[PDB]
Design a protein around this nucleic acid. Structure first.
Ligand SMILES: Nc1ncnc2c1ncn2[C@H]1C[C@H](O)[C@@H](COP(=O)(O)OP(=O)(O)OP(=O)(O)O)O1
Ligand SMILES: [Ca+2]
Length: 430
DNA sequence: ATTATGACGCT
DNA sequence: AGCGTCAT
C-alpha cells in the first residue's frame, strides 16, 4: 500500500541511432540515401560480412552477420558501403567520430551515459522538473509530441499506422492531470517533449535520425525504444507494465537475452516477464542468486534502480583482429607483424584521446585465441602501459604471450593464433 | 570464416 | 588478476 515503492522516481530515456553505420555512409554518399543498402567489412570472403542494414534492405530479409554474397540473393539491388581498411584491418574511426557528434549534442540537454557507439541513456528527472515550472499548469499539446507513441494505447470503446499513433496519444493526453507537478505520468510526458527536442536537434545538426524510449528506468527505456523503430519514440508508463509484460518473452529484457534468461525460463517453467510476479523474492534469490533474484523481483514489476552513470567517453580503447581458418598465424614473424599493426592503430587512437580528453591509459591488456578453442578469448595478460609508442607496446605484448607458443622451433608458432587483441585501460587524468 | 568492438560481474 | 557474460 502506502509504503510499497513503485519505481516512479526518475525520468530516464534511451536514445538509439537508427541503422547507425548505414546513416553515416548515407550522409557521406547521397547515392545511398533512401535505398536498400548495408555496410560490410572486408570483401574477399563471400563479398564481406554485413554489420549494418538499412530499413529498406531489411524488408528483403537482409540481416547483420550475413555475407554480402548471400544478402545479394535476397536483394539483388542491395547497395554496399565498405568499412575503411588501414594497416590490414577494419578501421572504425569514421563511426566513432560520428558517435561523438551525437553524444556532444545529447550532452547539451542532460547528463548522459554512453551505452555503446550509438546509444546513450539520459537522466531527465531534473530537466523535467525545470520544464514543469515553465509550463505552470499549462496543458501539453499533441503538437509537442509529433513522433511519440504511448505504449498500450489506444484501448477500449482508423486503419492507418499514424492514425493509431495519434489516437493513442489523444487518449493519453486527455487523461493527464497537468495540475499535479509530482505526477509520474505527467513527468514522463514532459520527458517525452524534451526527447522530441533532443531528437530534432540531433537530426538538424548531424543529419542522423534515431529512436528513443522514455520511462522510469534504464531497462524500461531500452525496451520502449525498440517498440517503434525507426525514427519514432515510445513512452512506457508504469501503468503499461502489467499488460506489456504479460506477453513479453523474457529474453527481450536487457541482461536476460543469454544464459541467465534461458535458466529463468527452464527452472521456473515460464515464458513471459509478467509470470515472474508469482514468485517471492526469496524464491528468485534461491535460484538466481541474491543480486539477480532481487533484480528480477523488482524488474518484473517495472522497477529498476540502476543509475544513469555520468560517463560520455569509453573507459577502454581497444584494437582486435581475427585470423580465421587457414589465415591463422603460424610464424613468430607473422605474430609480431600483426601485433605491430594493432599497436600502431592503438597508438594513433590513444594519442588523439590524450589530446582531446586530458587522460592517459596506464594498463595494456593483451588477449589471444588459440585454434581449436571454442571460447572467444583463450588467454589474457596485462602489462604496464608507460609510453604511447607502438613498437614498445607490440614488443611488450609479445613478451607477455610468447610463452604460450608450444612450438619447439622458435621461428614457428603453435598452436596457430586465430585472434589478437590489444586494449588500453586504467585511465588517469593528464 | 562473422568481426570489431565495449561494460561489468565473479572469484 | 584473469575469466566469463551480455551487449552494440
Ligand atoms: N555484432 C556487431 N558487429 C560489428 N558491429 C556491430 C555489431 N552490432 C552492431 N554493430 C555496429 C553497427 C551498427 O550500425 C551499430 C549500432 O548497432 P545496433 O544499434 O545494434 O544496430 P543499428 O543501429 O545498425 O540498427 P537499429 O536501427 O536496429 O538500431 O553498431
Ligand atoms: Ca542503433
Amino acid at each position: 500500500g502506502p509504503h510499497m515503492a513503485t519505481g516512479q522516481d526518475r525520468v530516464v530515456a534511451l536514445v538509439d541511432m537508427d541503422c547507425f553505420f548505414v546513416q553515416v555512409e548515407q550522409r557521406q554518399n547521397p547515392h545511398l540515401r533512401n535505398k536498400p543498402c548495408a555496410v560490410v567489412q572486408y570483401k574477399s570472403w563471400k563479398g564481406g560480412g554485413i554489420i549494418a542494414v538499412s530499413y529498406e534492405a531489411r524488408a528483403f530479409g537482409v540481416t547483420r552477420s550475413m555475407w554480402a554474397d548471400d544478402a545479394k540473393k535476397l536483394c539483388p539491388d542491395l547497395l554496399l558501403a565498405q568499412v575503411r581498411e588501414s594497416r590490414g584491418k577494419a578501421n572504425l574511426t569514421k563511426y566513432r567520430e560520428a558517435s561523438v557528434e551525437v553524444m556532444e549534442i545529447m550532452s547539451r540537454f542532460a547528463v548522459i551515459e554512453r551505452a555503446s557507439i550509438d546509444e546513450a541513456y539520459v537522466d531527465l528527472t531534473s530537466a523535467v522538473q525545470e520544464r514543469l515550472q515553465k509550463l505552470q499548469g499549462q496543458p501539453i499539446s499533441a503538437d509537442l509530441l509529433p513522433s511519440t507513441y504511448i505504449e498500450g494505447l489506444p484501448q477500449g470503446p482508423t486503419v492507418q499506422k499514424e492514425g493509431m499513433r495519434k489516437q493513442g496519444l489523444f487518449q493519453w493526453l486527455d487523461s493527464l492531470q497537468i495540475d499535479n507537478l509530482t505526477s509520474p505520468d505527467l513527468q514522463l510526458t514532459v520527458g517525452a517533449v524534451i526527447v522530441e527536442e533532443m531528437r530534432a536537434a540531433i537530426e538538424r545538426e548531424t543529419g542522423f535520425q534515431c529512436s528513443a524510449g522514455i520511462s522510469h528506468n534504464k531497462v524500461l527505456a531500452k525496451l520502449a525504444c525498440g517498440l517503434n523503430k525507426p525514427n519514432r519514440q515510445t513512452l512506457v508508463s508504469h501503468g503499461s507494465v502489467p499488460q506489456l509484460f504479460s506477453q513479453m518473452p523474457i529474453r527481450k529484457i536487457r541482461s536476460l537475452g543469454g544464459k541467465l534468461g534461458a535458466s529463468v525460463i527452464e527452472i521456473l517453467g515460464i515464458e513471459y516477464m509478467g509470470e515472474l510476479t508469482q514468485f517471492t523474492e526469496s524464491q528468485l534469490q534461491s535460484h538466481f542468486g541474491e543480486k539477480n533474484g532481487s533484480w528480477l523481483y523488482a524488474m518484473c514489476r517495472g522497477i529498476e534502480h540502476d543509475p544513469v552513470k555520468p560517463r560520455q567517453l569509453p573507459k577502454t580503447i581497444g584494437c582486435s583482429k581475427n585470423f580465421p581458418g587457414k589465415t591463422a598465424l603460424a610464424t613468430r614473424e607473422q605474430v609480431q607483424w600483426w601485433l605491430l599493426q594493432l599497436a600502431q592503430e592503438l597508438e594513433e587512437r590513444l594519442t588523439k584521446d590524450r589530446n582531446d580528453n586530458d587522460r592517459v591509459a596506464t594498463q595494456l591488456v593483451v588477449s589471444i585465441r588459440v585454434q581449436g578453442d571454442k571460447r572467444l578469448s583463450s588467454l589474457r595478460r596485462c602489462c604496464a602501459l608507460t609510453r604511447y609508442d607502438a613498437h614498445k607496446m607490440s614488443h611488450d605484448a609479445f613478451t607477455v604471450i610468447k610463452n604460450c607458443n608450444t612450438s619447439g622451433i622458435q621461428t614457428e608458432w603453435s598452436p596457430p593464433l586465430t585472434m589478437l587483441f590489444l586494449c588500453a585501460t586504467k585511465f588517469s587524468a593528464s
